[PDB]
Amino acid sequence: EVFNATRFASVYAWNRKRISNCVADYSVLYNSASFSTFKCYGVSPTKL
Amino acid sequence: LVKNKCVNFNFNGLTGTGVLTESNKKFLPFQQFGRDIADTTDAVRDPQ
Amino acid sequence: KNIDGYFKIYSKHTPINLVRDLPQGFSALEPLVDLPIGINITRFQTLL
Amino acid sequence: SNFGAISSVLNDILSRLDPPEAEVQIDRLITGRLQSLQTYVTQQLIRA
Numbered sequence A: 001e002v003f004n005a006t007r008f009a010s011v012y013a014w015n016r017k018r019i020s021n022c023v024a025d026y027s028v029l030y031n032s033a034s035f036s037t038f039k040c041y042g043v044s045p046t047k048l
Numbered sequence B: 001l002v003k004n005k006c007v008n009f010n011f012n013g014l015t016g017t018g019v020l021t022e023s024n025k026k027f028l029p030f031q032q033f034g035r036d037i038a039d040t041t042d043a044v045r046d047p048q
Numbered sequence C: 001k002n003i004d005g006y007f008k009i010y011s012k013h014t015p016i017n018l019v020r021d022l023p024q025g026f027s028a029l030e031p032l033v034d035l036p037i038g039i040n041i042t043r044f045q046t047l048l
Numbered sequence D: 001s002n003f004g005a006i007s008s009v010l011n012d013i014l015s016r017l018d019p020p021e022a023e024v025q026i027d028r029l030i031t032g033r034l035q036s037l038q039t040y041v042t043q044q045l046i047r048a
């Protein structure tokens, strides 16, 4: 739901959404790969 | 969970290689790790 | 206290006999609640 | 100590990071932790 949400709020607002009591894979985020720049800072998105 | 036989491991992503045992140490409930001086990971708690 | 959107509460439910003032004595205070909310607080008031 | 490096533990610099990161980071550890020995060694020699 975080990506496929409808409107995204303007910048001077925004929503910090807890995603918790759950399992989150990162492939479906990462390996979907239509993502212009997926730029990690600390982590290496394979390691996730 | 292999015990008292040298194993690699990962608990909740906190990794290392150790000889896992059972322990008299009594956590306070909220806690997760232990430590000792070196930034050791001394004790842990079976996550499941 | 509120640390960067979290919130903490510690406790003792502990006995005393004095009318006027604190028993002078030491007690540690282990957490009961931990809430990584994200609210801020500048002020407050109790209830009765 | 982090010696300026972005973490204390080697693995967590290993895991999290891309080698061209890890390399430049892992130096700071090494160069630091190395130099810590030469201090500790010299202290021995002088003391011993």
Ligand SMILES: *[C@@H]1O[C@H](CO)[C@@H](O)[C@H](O)[C@H]1NC(C)=O
Pocket: B047, B048
């Ligand atoms: C894992 O399952 C056991 C039931 O056998 C349960 O007691 C335990 O709470 C579960 N783990 C977690 C993290 O809830």
